[PDB]
C-alpha cells in the first residue's frame, strides 16, 4: 500500500501561495521539509520546481508538466498518472505543491505534513478544504519565532481515518 502524502506550509486562512514568494523566512520549516522528504520520491508542479531553482538532492524529483521539460536532472511527467508510475514501488511518495497539484492528489492522499505559520499574508491561493472529521492528528510540535525564523510555526502530521 503506497502512502501518498501531502506536505505544505500554510499561513493564516489556509493560504499557501500568492503572486510572488511567501513573505516569511523559516529555515526551520525547510529543515522539516528536508527531513521528511529525503530518500523519497517528490512530486511537484513545474512552477514549484522553478521556485526551488534546482533539483532537490537525495530524492527522486518528479516534475509534472504538459510541455517537455528543459532540465535533464529531474524526471518529467506529463500527468499525475505518469508521476505516480515514476515513483515506482516506493512506500511513501511526497506531494509538495503547488495549489493545483494538491487538489489533484487530495483524494488519493492518506497522510499530510502541515506546517501552520502564524502569518496573515493576504494571499489568494489556498490549501484544499478537507473534512476535519476524516483526518486525525498523530503528531504536533510548536515553535516560537526566533532570530532565525520570522514567524512562529506548528508542525503537524495528519492521517486519514
Ligand X SMILES: CN(Cc1cnc2nc(N)nc(N)c2n1)c1ccc(C(=O)N[C@@H](CCC(=O)O)C(=O)O)cc1
83 binds ligand X (CB under 6 A): no
Residue nearest K ion, CB atom distance: 72
What is the smallest separation between the CB atom of 72 and K ion, expressed in angstroms? 4
Decide: 8 and 33 in contact? Cβ < 8 Å: no
Question: Using CA atoms, how far apart are residues 98 and 44, in angstroms rounded to an integer?
Answer: 7
Question: Using CA atoms, how far apart are residues 149 and 10, in angstroms rounded to an integer?
Answer: 15
What is the smallest separation between the CB atom of 123 and ligand X, expressed in angstroms? 14
Residues lying near K ion in the complex (CB under 5 A) are found at 72
What kind and span of H or E run contains 92? strand 92-95
Question: Using CA atoms, how far apart are residues 84 and 122, in angstroms rounded to an integer?
Answer: 33
Q: Which of 46, 51, 125, 151 binds ligand X (CB under 6 A)?
A: 51
Decide: 159 and 111 in contact? Cβ < 8 Å: yes
Q: Which of 4, 7, 17, 37 binds Ca ion (CB under 5 A)?
A: 17
Which partner from the list ligand X, Ca ion, K ion, none does 33 bind, CB cut-off 5 to 8 Å by kind? ligand X
**Which span sits near ligand X by CB under 6 A: 6-14, 62-70, 84-92, 124-132?**
6-14
Cis peptide before 139 (omega within 30 of 0): no
17 binds ligand X (CB under 6 A): no
Residues at the interface with Ca ion (CB under 5 A): 17
Amino acid at each position: 500500500a503506497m502512502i501518498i502524502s501531502l506536505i505544505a506550509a500554510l499561513a493564516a486562512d489556509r493560504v499557501i501561495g500568492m503572486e510572488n514568494a511567501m513573505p516569511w523566512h523559516l529555515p526551520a520549516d525547510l529543515a522539516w521539509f528536508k527531513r521528511n522528504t529525503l530518500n523519497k520520491p517528490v512530486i511537484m508542479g513545474r512552477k514549484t520546481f522553478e521556485s526551488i531553482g534546482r533539483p532537490l538532492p537525495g530524492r527522486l524529483n518528479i516534475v509534472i508538466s504538459s510541455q517537455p521539460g528543459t532540465d535533464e536532472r529531474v524526471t518529467w511527467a506529463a500527468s499525475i498518472e505518469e508521476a505516480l508510475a515514476f515513483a515506482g514501488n516506493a512506500e511513501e511518495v511526497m506531494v509538495m505543491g503547488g495549489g493545483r497539484v494538491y487538489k489533484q492528489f487530495l483524494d488519493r492522499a492518506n497522510r499530510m505534513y502541515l506546517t501552520h505559520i502564524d502569518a496573515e499574508v493576504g494571499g489568494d491561493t489556498h490549501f484544499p478544504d478537507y473534512e476535519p472529521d476524516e483526518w486525525e492528528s498523530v503528531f504536533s510540535e510548536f515553535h516560537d519565532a526566533d532570530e532565525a525564523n520570522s514567524h512562529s510555526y506548528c508542525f503537524e502530521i495528519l492521517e486519514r481515518r
